[PDB]
């Protein structure tokens, strides 16, 4: 085509994020009158979301995912999108994005310093925690073995409730909890399903303990070469998959925690007051290590409120 342009992932072709990636490939094919042709590179196959965002930058990867709470490798005070317990739902996301003074600045500096437009967000699940042994309180979170990307907010939440934290390249995870190598992760239920964690875990505690939102990025170097009639098309096509995405991801959620008890795993709910409690001492520790940034963007966040 006029424009062979790549889409890369680190979810895998089960997934909700692939579906809704092959919605806008498709929907771009079309309505760019196949000018444009998406094709997509999921489970990692370029490298991590770290590495594909470092691949939009340079120019050669032209479009990829990302959470807001990723960009905390750059700007540290980002990391106030997945501070544990933090952000309530995805109603708070969006306006912590799209609609404080922090989340305005967040992405100009993207597409300024880090070589990426902004084109949707979605909603991509609250993380939750499965394990190879009941979770019924906190207590049983002590020494546990728990796998976790490489990020500093996840390794925090697997210290901060008294784990052991692990962390693990994604497509590594299975593995690693079939073999016990590790005891538990913690992703959402969807990633859950889409990887067959439940396979591999007897367990699944309802921690509710981050919540996931998902960028649709692209290069700049790719969407400053597209005329803007087709620049449009991109756009259009980038906001219509996001609803679509977030779509996928609550309706999981009404279903899947039936769907894994089907599957023979047993279901807890932990009584969520201590694991909240926990983390007072890493907000007090974000907010010396960020500083004055951190405490406004955390202000500007918690003045958000969560009802629609
Ligand atoms: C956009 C993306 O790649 N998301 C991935 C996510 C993020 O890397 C971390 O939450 C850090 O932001 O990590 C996983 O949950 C993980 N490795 O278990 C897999 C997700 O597909």
């Given at each position: 085509?006029?424009?062979?342009?790549?889409?890369?992932?680190?979810?895998?072709?089960?997934?909700?994020?692939?579906?809704?990636?092959?919605?806008?490939?498709?929907?771009?094919?079309?309505?760019?009158?196949?000018?444009?042709?998406?094709?997509?590179?999921?489970?990692?196959?370029?490298?991590?979301?770290?590495?594909?965002?470092?691949?939009?930058?340079?120019?050669?990867?032209?479009?990829?995912?990302?959470?807001?709470?990723?960009?905390?490798?750059?700007?540290?005070?980002?990391?106030?999108?997945?501070?544990?317990?933090?952000?309530?739902?995805?109603?708070?996301?969006?306006?912590?994005?799209?609609?404080?003074?922090?989340?305005?600045?967040?992405?100009?500096?993207?597409?300024?310093?880090?070589?990426?437009?902004?084109?949707?967000?979605?909603?991509?699940?609250?993380?939750?925690?499965?394990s190879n042994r009941a979770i019924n309180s906190?207590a049983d979170?002590?020494?546990?073995?728990?796998?976790?990307?490489?990020?500093?907010?996840?390794?925090?939440?697997?210290?901060?409730?008294?784990?052991?934290?692990?962390?693990?390249?994604?497509?590594?995870?299975?593995?690693?909890?079939?073999?016990?190598?590790?005891?538990?992760?913690?992703?959402?239920?969807?990633?859950?399903?889409?990887?067959?964690?439940?396979?591999?875990?007897k367990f699944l505690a309802?921690?509710?303990?981050?919540?996931?939102?998902?960028?649709?990025?692209?290069?700049?170097?790719?969407?400053?070469?597209?005329?803007?009639?087709?620049?449009?098309?991109?756009?259009?096509?980038?906001?219509?998959?996001?609803?679509?995405?977030?779509?996928?991801?609550?309706?999981?959620?009404?279903?899947?925690?039936?769907?894994?008890?089907?599957?023979?795993?047993k279901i807890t709910?932990p009584?969520?007051?201590?694991?909240?409690?926990?983390?007072?001492?890493?907000?007090?520790?974000?907010?010396?290590?960020?500083?004055?940034?951190?405490?406004?963007?955390?202000?500007?966040?918690?003045?958000?409120?969560?009802?629609?």
């Amino acid at each position: 085509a006029d424009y062979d342009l790549k889409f890369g992932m680190n979810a895998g072709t089960s997934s909700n994020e692939y579906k809704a990636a092959e919605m806008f490939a498709k929907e771009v094919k079309e309505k760019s009158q196949g000018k444009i042709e998406i094709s997509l590179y999921p489970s990692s196959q370029l490298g991590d979301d770290r590495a594909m965002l470092k691949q939009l930058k340079d120019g050669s990867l032209d479009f990829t995912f990302a959470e807001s709470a990723r960009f905390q490798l750059f700007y540290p005070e980002a990391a106030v999108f997945a501070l544990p317990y933090v952000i309530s739902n995805y109603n708070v996301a969006q306006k912590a994005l799209f609609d404080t003074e922090f989340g305005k600045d967040l992405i100009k500096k993207m597409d300024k310093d880090l070589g990426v437009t902004l084109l949707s967000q979605a909603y991509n699940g609250t993380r939750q925690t499965t394990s190879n042994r009941a979770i019924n309180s906190i207590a049983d979170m002590k020494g546990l073995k728990l796998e976790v990307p490489n990020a500093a907010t996840n390794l925090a939440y697997a210290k901060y409730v008294g784990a052991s934290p692990t962390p693990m390249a994604f497509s590594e995870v299975y593995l690693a909890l079939q073999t016990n190598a590790v005891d538990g992760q913690e992703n959402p239920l969807a990633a859950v399903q889409a990887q067959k964690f439940y396979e591999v875990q007897k367990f699944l505690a309802m921690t509710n303990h981050i919540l996931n939102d998902q960028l649709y990025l692209v290069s700049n170097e790719t969407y400053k070469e597209l005329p803007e009639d087709l620049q449009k098309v991109v756009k259009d096509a980038a906001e219509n998959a996001a609803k679509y995405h977030t779509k996928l991801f609550v309706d999981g959620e009404k279903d899947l925690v039936t769907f894994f008890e089907k599957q023979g795993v047993k279901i807890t709910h932990p009584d969520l007051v201590p694991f909240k409690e926990s983390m007072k001492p890493y907000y007090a520790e974000f907010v010396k290590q960020t500083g004055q940034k951190g405490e406004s963007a955390l202000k500007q966040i918690e003045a958000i409120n969560p009802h629609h």
